[PDB]
């Protein structure tokens, strides 16, 4: 947060893009080198960029590095959709705040098309059901952009009661997925003829259903 | 060269948090290496926690240096993090790095080279659950495992001890009013196998030392 980075930045494939990172005069100012850090979604950061401009081995040529003033960049040429990532910048401080300063991180977006969500709706368990208790599950995955309506319906009538619905998470394929849960007693669950979960993503609407059948 | 993150995925506040790390291929004092801890709060950016080196010697950042202590054990090759009179902001993911030096008139703080895989230490004044595994049926066939009520996250879900790679997606825990989570797992797979395969999920709670093994049947 010390040193700045853009909170976002975005491209389309085979382009080239740039991440900045400028701090005050300890920090790069000074002449301290500046490292860069890559990190996938849900993963541990790796090391991208070292001192300023240098690639460990294991990184492509398409990636480079470049300090200059109070500034440092990231270049990134040739743009891949595997590039989508949360990027990082390092550099020594002098100042009250530590040795080792961090920038606020930038969330790269790679350019993808629309995807419509996959949604699979699975009715109460049989073993959950002999706990007195009810739950139906609503996943919809691999879909962008991460925006979502999720609608509950017992047989045509809609009812927003017991609802548990998640925000949006993109996946290693960078694509979002989201989960919603409905929580009923047994007996609703059975006294209606059918649920219905129903999501709207870009002006056209997946609506699954089930009702209780045993078997 | 690998680093393993270990300890506690849940400690109260006003309680001193005990991280470690093993280290491994290398050795812990070996010269020319630091070994520091990076924290990361849930969709929040890194934050250097502190940084030993090969000697004892510790170095820490001024935001957290009253309640943060770093150790090495040489013999055991192992780091710890202690960070005492815990709060909210203090939930994060926290990671063990291996930190690289330039030698001029001090020795320089450098590139983090090697990371490894943090722990998720939820700071909070609840008590860790274990969850209540139940399965769901298939229906070219979908089927899957339900983790409920159970805290704190994480939750590693498993696929035929490993074995059932293709087609699995596990899905984000949601957070109950309860306050507990919930979380789901599902595999994609060919309806031809549904009677001829067997098809086990095996949820793993580290929190509350769980792991759930179960059966996933049609009908």
């Known amino acids: 947060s010390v040193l700045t980075q853009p909170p976002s930045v975005s491209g389309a494939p085979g382009q080239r893009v740039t991440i900045s990172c400028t701090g005050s005069?300890?920090?790069?100012?000074?002449?301290?080198?500046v490292h860069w850090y890559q990190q996938l979604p849900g993963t541990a950061p790796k090391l991208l960029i070292y001192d300023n401009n240098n690639r460990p081995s294991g990184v492509p040529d398409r990636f480079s590095g470049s300090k200059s003033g109070t500034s440092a960049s990231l270049a990134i040429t040739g743009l891949q959709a595997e590039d989508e990532a949360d990027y990082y910048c390092?550099?020594?401080?002098?100042?009250?705040?530590?040795?080792?300063?961090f920038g606020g991180g930038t969330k790269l977006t790679v350019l993808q098309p629309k995807a419509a969500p996959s949604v699979t709706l699975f009715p109460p368990s049989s073993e959950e059901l002999q706990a007195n208790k009810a739950t139906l599950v609503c996943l919809i995955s691999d879909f962008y952009p991460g925006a979502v309506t999720v609608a509950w319906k017992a047989d045509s009538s809609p009812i927003k009661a017991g609802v548990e619905t998640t925000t949006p998470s993109k996946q290693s394929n960078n694509k979002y997925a989201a989960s919603s849960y409905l929580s009923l007693t047994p007996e609703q669950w059975k006294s209606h003829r059918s649920y219905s979960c129903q999501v709207t993503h870009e002006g056209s609407t997946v609506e699954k259903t089930v009702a209780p059948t045993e078997c | 060269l690998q680093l393993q993150e270990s300890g506690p995925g849940l400690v109260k506040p006003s309680e001193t948090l005990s991280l470690s790390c093993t280290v491994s291929g290398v050795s812990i004092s070996d010269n020319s290496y630091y070994w520091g801890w990076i924290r990361q709060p849930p969709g929040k950016g890194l934050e250097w926690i502190g940084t030993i080196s090969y000697s004892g010697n510790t170095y820490y950042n001024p935001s957290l240096k009253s309640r943060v202590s770093i150790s090495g054990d040489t013999s055991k090759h192992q780091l710890s993090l202690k960070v005492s009179s815990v709060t909210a902001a203090d939930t994060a993911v926290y990671y063990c790095?291996?930190?690289?030096?330039?030698?001029?008139?001090?020795?320089?703080?450098?590139?983090?080279?090697?990371w490894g895989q943090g722990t998720l230490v939820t700071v909070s004044s609840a008590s860790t659950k274990g969850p209540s595994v139940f399965p769901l049926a298939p229906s070219t066939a979908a089927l899957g495992c339900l983790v409920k009520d159970y805290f704190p996250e994480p939750v590693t879900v498993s696929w035929n001890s490993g074995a059932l790679t293709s087609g699995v997606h596990t899905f984000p825990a949601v957070l109950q009013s309860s306050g507990l989570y919930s979380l789901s797992s599902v595999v994609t797979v060919p309806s031809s196998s549904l009677g001829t395969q067997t098809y086990i999920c095996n949820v793993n709670h580290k929190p509350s030392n769980t792991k759930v093994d179960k059966k996933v049947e049609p009908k």
């Open positions: 005069s300890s920090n790069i100012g000074a002449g301290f080198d």
């Open positions: 390092q550099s020594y401080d002098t100042s009250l705040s530590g040795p080792v300063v």
């Open positions: 790095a291996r930190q690289r030096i330039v030698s001029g008139f001090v020795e320089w703080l450098s590139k983090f080279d090697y």
